[PDB]
């Protein structure tokens, strides 16, 4: 997913399901 997580959790990736992993959203894509 285009959002790191480092600092903040997932925004515009949160609304695709991304999740926060390893610092970085994730979901099945980066």
Excluded: M
């Excluded at 285009?2 to 994730?26: D, K």
Aim: hydrophobic share 30%.
């Amino acid at each position: 997913c285009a959002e790191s997580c480092v600092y903040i959790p997932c925004t515009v990736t949160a609304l695709l399901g991304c999740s926060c992993s390893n610092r970085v959203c994730y979901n099945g894509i980066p």
